[PDB]
Amino acid sequence: GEKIRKKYPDRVPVIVEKAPKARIGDLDKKKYLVPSDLTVGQFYFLIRKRIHLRAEDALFFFVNNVIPPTSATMGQLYQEHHEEDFFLYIAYSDESVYGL
């Protein structure tokens, strides 16, 4: 992370994980390097394909036990949903309603 900030000081290395016993599509990597100016809608597009979901699948991102609307950005979330060291933590599941 020390070298990632030296070359990408304005970037936001986010960590990706899944909910407790989640069941979404496969995953290519669990670490995205997005700029601090990226919005939530942009980040939702780069994970969408990485979650092997498309057309009309179900998905909900949970970061630091929170679920804000698409009126935010990855850089601002760094100081909000960070998790030890510099890297921040983000997770997702297939649903967020009363059920499994």
mmCIF file of C-alpha atoms in Angstrom, residues 36-48 61 63 67-77 81:
data_model
loop_
_atom_site.group_PDB
_atom_site.id
_atom_site.type_symbol
_atom_site.label_atom_id
_atom_site.label_comp_id
_atom_site.label_asym_id
_atom_site.label_seq_id
_atom_site.Cartn_x
_atom_site.Cartn_y
_atom_site.Cartn_z
ATOM 1 C CA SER A 36 -11.193 9.235 -5.249
ATOM 2 C CA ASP A 37 -13.447 11.127 -7.739
ATOM 3 C CA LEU A 38 -15.318 7.934 -8.840
ATOM 4 C CA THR A 39 -18.990 7.872 -7.779
ATOM 5 C CA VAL A 40 -20.924 4.878 -6.339
ATOM 6 C CA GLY A 41 -22.654 4.223 -9.719
ATOM 7 C CA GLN A 42 -19.232 3.893 -11.457
ATOM 8 C CA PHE A 43 -17.852 1.464 -8.847
ATOM 9 C CA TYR A 44 -21.141 -0.514 -9.066
ATOM 10 C CA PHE A 45 -20.395 -1.100 -12.785
ATOM 11 C CA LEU A 46 -16.818 -2.467 -12.338
ATOM 12 C CA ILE A 47 -17.920 -5.022 -9.637
ATOM 13 C CA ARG A 48 -21.182 -5.941 -11.461
ATOM 14 C CA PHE A 61 -23.106 -3.540 -1.324
ATOM 15 C CA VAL A 63 -19.437 -1.245 3.509
ATOM 16 C CA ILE A 67 -25.549 1.019 2.746
ATOM 17 C CA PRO A 68 -25.521 4.586 1.373
ATOM 18 C CA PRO A 69 -27.270 5.629 -1.869
ATOM 19 C CA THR A 70 -25.450 6.268 -5.198
ATOM 20 C CA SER A 71 -24.937 9.943 -4.196
ATOM 21 C CA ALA A 72 -21.341 9.392 -2.968
ATOM 22 C CA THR A 73 -17.814 8.594 -4.228
ATOM 23 C CA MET A 74 -15.025 6.028 -3.589
ATOM 24 C CA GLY A 75 -12.511 8.669 -2.370
ATOM 25 C CA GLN A 76 -14.928 10.076 0.254
ATOM 26 C CA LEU A 77 -15.835 6.515 1.412
ATOM 27 C CA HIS A 81 -15.644 2.846 5.516
#
